[PDB]
Design a binder for these strands. Structure first.
Ligand SMILES: [Mg+2]
Ligand SMILES: [Mg+2]
Ligand SMILES: [Zn+2]
Lengths: 246, 447, 110
DNA sequence: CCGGGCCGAGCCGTGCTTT
DNA sequence: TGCACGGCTCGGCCCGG
C-alpha cells in the first residue's frame, strides 16, 4: 500500500515509452529511496537501467520494498492517455491490482492486472572507457538521421580536442565533425585515439525521445560497448549499453 | 553390434626399407584462400530479399567474365562485338559474340540458341550442315560459348562456327624426375553403413603396409608416397527418409571416430589429403570450404592428414592434380542422351571441355549464393579425379588423365531399384612423373 | 523436420519472378532488373521461410526426451542454415551475453 | 494548421523429408 | 487443403514544425 504522486504525466509517459521500445516485460523495484528498473532485450544486445529517487517525486509514501511487474504495452497506452499538465497518481492496496489515476480537469482511474516475471540480476562491471563526450540531444539525433540515409552502421572516431561520427555506403558517404570551440560540444576527455561502430537500428530506437536542448554523455572505448547517459529532472538517470559491431 | 574398428592394428612389415625420397608438395588452390566480399546494399535499410538476388547476379557476372578471358586466348578468335552494340554492324562483316546459353531447341533446319550478355540478348541459328553442329548439340544451358556469324537486321544472328573453351592441343612437357613415385586414389568410403565391406578395406590397409605377393608389388609399395580421398568418407545422418534402419553406426560423431581409427594404420611415410562430399558434415551446397571442425575433429587430429576443400588443386613434383567430388556428372548424364553411369569418364571429359565443374543451375546440384564463381577450371591440370558414382573409369583427353575412383560400399536397395551396378574395391595407381594410371589394384574378393 | 529440410533444399534451385508481370526466370538477369518490364526481381523462397519453425524445433529437442538421431538432425540443420549464408550475411553484430540455453553447443562440448 | 510517417487492411505470389 | 513468409497499394490517424 503506497501513494506516489507525480506532476506532469506527459514526461513520465515519455520516459516509460522510451524504456519500453527495446524490451517487453520488466519488474519495477520500489523501496524507501525510489524506483529502479533493469532488463535486457530478447536479442541480448541492449541493457537498460533506470532509477527515480524520492527527491523528484512530489509526494512519496512506501513501507518496506516490493517489486511490481506489468506488461509494457498496456502501461504505455494508459500513460499515453494522460495530458501535459495533469498529476499522475500510482496507488495500490492489498489486492494485487495496479490502480492508475490521472487528476487534471477530471479524475479517471484505470485498473491494470499484475504479472510475475523471472528476475535475472546481472551487473556489468565498469570497463576502461578511453573517451567521454558530452553533446546535445539535437546534434546526435540529426547525425543518426543522416547516417541512416546512406548505410545501416555508424562509426565514432574520438581524438584529442576532436570528435566525429561517420557513415559509409556502397557509393555515398556521410560525415559529421565538431570541436570544443563549437557550441554543439561541451567537454571532451580522450586518453587515446578511439574507433568503434554500432548498428543504426538500435541507435535510432534508443535516441528517439530526446529533447533538442539536453545533455547526453557517451562513454566508449576501442571495439568495446558504449554507454549513454542523461538525467531525468536532475536526480534520476537512464543508462543504455550497446554492443559494438564487427 | 556397435563396434567402431577400435582394435584394428596393422604393423609395418620389417622386410622392406622405404626408399628415402624428398617429399615435395604444395596446395595450389583452396576455397578458403580467397576472401569474398559481401555486396554492400545500396540503401540504409536494405532488407534480406534484395541482397540474395544481388549475390546471385554477381555470381553469374563473375562466371561470365572469368570464362570469357579463357576464350580470348586461342588466336583463332578475334573481333568480338558487344551484344548491346551488335545492331551497328553491316550485313557483310564477320563478327563473334560470347555469352551464356539461356536455352536451346532443335528443329529440322538446325538449332535455336538464346544467348545473353551483360548488355543484351540475341537469337542464334546453327545450320545443320555445319561441322560444329554435332559438337554444339551436347551443350547444356548456362555454359559460356562463342559464336561467329553474320548479323541480319531481320533479328537473328546466323552463325557458321561454334567454340568451347576447350583445352589446348599443344603443351610443353615438364622435366623428368630423378626417381619414380606413386600415388593411390580412393573415394566414397561410406563408413558407418550396413553395406560398407570392411574386410576388403582391411586387406587394402595390410597391402599398404607391405603384405604383397609378387616382387613388382613389393617394389611399388616401397615407393607409394601419397594417398588421396575425394569425399563421402562417412554415410551421414538423415540423408534420406528411413535411413536409421540402414545404419550400423547411427551417430555422426561415432562415424567420424571409427573412420579416424581405421586410417591410423596408414604408414607414417605416406601423406593423406581428404576432401568432403555430399553425405559428410559439410556445407549444404557446393563449393564446400572444409568439414565442420566441431563434428569431424578426430580426422583433423591425425598426424599425416591434410584436409583440403572441394574443389582443390594439389601440386606434386610439378604436376597439377585437380580433385573434386563429382556431383556435376549427374547433370551431364541427364542432359546428354546416350551417356550412362557405367562409363563416367565421358561426362568428366565433357565437363573439362566446358571448363566448369557444375554449369547448370536449378537441376540436381545445389549452388550457394557466393559473389564470385570458384568452380571454373582456370588452369589446365595434368590429372582430374572424381567420385560420387561408385563406378571405376579412366580415359585420356588431349594429354590430361581423367580418373573416377570407385567406392567401398556394396550395392544398396536404391541402386537395385535404379539399376546401378557399383564396382567396389578398385584402387587406381598413378605415376607422379607422368601423371598416368599405370596399374589398378583389386581387393573385391572379400567385399 | 520435413518442412525445414524441404524449404532448405528448395532454396538452392528456386525460380525468380518479376513483381510486375508474373513471368518466371530460371536464373536472375545479370543486369538486375526485369528486361521487357519496369519492375524488380523477387525471390520465391525467402530466407525467413526456411527458418520459421526452427525455434519450436529447438524447444522440442531441448525440453523433452527424444532419440539422439533427431537431436543431431536438428543440431546439424541449424549449422547448415547458418553455413549457407556465410558470404552474404556475415555475423557482424557482437552480443553482450551468450549461452541462451543452447543445446547444440552443450552437445558438442560434451 | 497542413503535411509526412507509420501502420493495418486487402489483392497478387511461393513453398511444405527423397540415396 | 490449411497454415507460414514475403513484394505492393491505400486510406486514417496522428504528431511536430
Ligand atoms: Mg557416394
Ligand atoms: Mg555422394
Ligand atoms: Zn517484368
Amino acid at each position: 500500500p503506497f501513494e506516489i504522486v507525480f506532476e506532469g504525466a506527459k514526461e513520465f509517459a515519455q520516459l516509460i515509452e522510451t524504456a519500453s521500445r527495446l524490451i517487453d516485460e520488466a519488474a519495477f523495484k520500489v523501496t524507501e529511496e525510489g524506483i529502479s528498473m533493469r532488463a535486457m532485450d530478447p536479442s541480448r544486445v541492449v541493457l537498460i537501467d533506470l532509477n527515480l529517487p524520492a527527491s523528484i517525486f512530489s509526494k512519496y509514501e512506501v513501507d518496506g520494498e516490493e517489486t511490481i511487474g506489468v506488461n509494457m504495452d498496456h502501461l504505455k497506452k494508459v500513460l499515453k492517455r494522460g495530458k501535459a499538465k495533469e498529476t499522475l497518481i500510482l496507488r495500490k492496496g492489498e489486492e494485487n491490482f495496479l490502480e492508475i489515476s490521472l487528476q487534471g480537469t477530471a479524475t479517471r482511474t484505470f485498473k491494470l492486472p499484475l504479472i510475475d516475471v523471472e528476475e535475472i540480476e546481472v551487473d556489468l562491471p565498469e570497463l576502461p572507457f578511453t573517451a567521454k563526450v558530452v553533446i546535445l540531444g539535437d546534434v546526435i539525433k540529426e547525425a543518426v538521421k543522416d547516417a541512416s540515409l546512406v548505410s545501416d552502421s555508424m562509426k565514432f572516431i574520438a581524438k584529442e580536442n576532436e570528435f566525429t561520427m561517420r557513415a559509409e555506403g556502397e557509393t555515398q558517404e556521410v560525415e559529421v565533425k565538431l570541436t570544443l570551440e563549437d557550441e554543439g560540444l561541451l567537454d571532451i576527455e580522450v586518453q587515446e585515439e578511439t574507433k568503434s561502430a554500432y548498428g543504426i537500428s538500435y541507435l535510432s530506437d534508443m535516441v528517439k525521445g530526446l529533447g533538442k536542448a539536453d545533455e547526453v554523455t557517451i562513454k566508449f572505448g576501442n571495439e568495446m560497448p558504449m554507454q549513454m547517459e542523461y538525467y531525468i529532472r536532475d536526480e534520476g538517470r537512464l543508462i543504455f549499453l550497446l554492443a559494438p559491431r564487427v | 553390434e556397435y563396434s567402431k574398428y577400435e582394435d584394428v592394428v596393422i604393423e609395418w612389415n620389417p622386410s622392406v626399407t622405404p626408399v628415402q625420397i624428398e617429399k615435395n608438395y604444395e596446395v595450389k588452390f583452396d576455397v578458403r584462400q580467397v576472401k569474398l566480399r559481401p555486396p554492400k546494399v545500396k540503401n540504409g535499410s536494405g532488407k534480406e530479399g534484395e541482397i540474395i538476388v544481388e549475390a546471385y547476379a554477381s555470381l553469374f557476372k563473375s562466371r561470365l567474365s572469368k570464362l570469357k578471358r579463357i576464350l580470348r586466348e586461342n588466336p583463332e578468335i578475334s573481333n568480338v562485338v558487344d551484344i548491346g552494340k551488335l545492331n551497328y554492324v553491316s550485313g557483310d562483316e564477320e563478327v563473334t559474340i560470347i555469352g551464356l546459353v539461356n536455352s536451346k531447341r532443335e528443329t529440322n533446319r538446325g538449332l535455336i540458341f538464346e544467348v545473353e550478355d551483360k548488355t543484351g540478348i540475341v537469337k542464334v541459328f546453327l545450320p545443320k550442315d555445319s561441322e560444329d553442329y554435332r559438337e554444339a548439340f551436347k551443350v547444356l544451358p548456362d555454359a559460356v560459348v562463342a559464336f561467329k556469324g553474320f548479323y541480319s537486321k531481320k533479328g537473328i544472328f546466323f552463325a557458321n562456327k561454334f567454340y568451347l573453351p576447350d583445352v589446348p592441343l599443344y603443351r610443353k612437357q615438364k622435366p623428368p624426375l630423378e626417381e619414380k613415385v606413386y600415388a593411390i586414389l580412393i573415394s566414397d568410403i561410406h563408413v558407418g553403413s550396413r553395406e560398407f565391406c570392411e574386410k576388403a578395406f582391411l586387406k587394402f590397409l595390410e597391402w599398404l603396409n607391405g603384405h604383397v605377393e609378387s616382387k613388382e608389388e613389393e617394389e611399388i609399395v616401397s615407393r607409394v608416397k601419397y594417398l588421396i580421398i575425394a569425399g563421402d568418407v562417412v554415410d551421414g545422418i538423415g540423408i534420406y527418409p528411413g535411413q536409421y534402419s540402414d545404419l550400423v553406426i547411427p551417430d555422426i560423431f561415432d562415424q567420424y571416430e571409427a573412420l579416424a581409427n581405421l586410417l591410423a594404420n596408414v604408414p607414417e611415410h605416406i601423406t593423406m589429403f581428404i576432401g568432403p562430399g555430399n553425405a559428410d558434415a559439410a556445407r549444404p551446397a557446393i563449393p564446400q570450404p572444409e568439414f565442420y571442425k566441431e563434428y569431424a575433429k578426430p580426422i583433423y587430429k591425425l598426424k599425416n592428414a591434410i584436409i583440403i576443400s572441394n574443389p582443390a588443386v594439389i601440386r606434386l613434383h610439378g604436376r597439377d592434380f585437380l580433385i573434386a567430388h563429382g556431383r556435376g556428372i549427374e547433370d551431364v548424364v541427364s542432359f546428354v542422351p546416350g551417356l550412362t553411369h557405367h562409363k563416367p569418364g565421358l561426362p568428366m571429359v565433357e565437363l573439362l571441355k566446358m571448363r566448369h565443374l557444375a554449369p547448370t543451375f536449378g537441376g540436381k546440384v545445389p549452388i550457394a549464393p557466393d559473389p564470385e564463381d570458384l568452380l571454373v577450371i582456370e588452369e589446365v591440370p595434368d590429372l582430374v579425379q572424381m567420385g560420387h558414382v561408385h563406378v571405376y573409369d579412366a580415359v585420356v583427353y588431349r594429354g590430361v588423365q581423367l580418373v573416377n575412383s570407385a567406392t567401398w560400399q556394396a550395392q544398396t536397395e536404391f541402386q537395385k531399384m535404379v539399376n546401378i551396378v557399383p564396382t567396389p574395391a578398385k584402387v587406381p595407381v598413378v605415376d607422379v612423373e607422368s601423371a598416368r594410371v599405370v596399374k589398378v589394384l583389386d581387393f573385391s574378393g572379400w567385399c | 523436420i520435413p518442412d525445414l529440410r524441404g524449404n532448405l533444399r528448395s532454396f538452392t534451385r528456386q525460380e525468380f519472378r518479376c513483381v510486375k508481370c508474373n513471368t518466371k526466370f530460371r536464373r536472375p538477369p545479370l543486369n538486375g532488373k526485369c528486361p521487357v518490364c519496369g519492375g524488380k526481381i523477387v525471390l520465391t523462397v525467402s530466407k525467413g521461410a526456411i527458418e520459421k519453425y526452427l525455434g519450436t524445433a529447438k524447444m522440442l529437442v531441448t525440453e523433452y526426451n527424444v532419440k539422439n538421431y533427431t537431436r543431431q538432425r536438428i543440431c546439424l540443420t541449424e549449422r547448415d542454415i547458418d553455413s549457407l549464408f556465410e558470404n552474404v550475411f556475415p555475423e557482424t553484430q557482437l552480443t553482450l551475453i551468450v549461452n541462451p540455453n543452447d543445446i547444440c553447443q552443450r552437445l558438442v562440448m560434451a
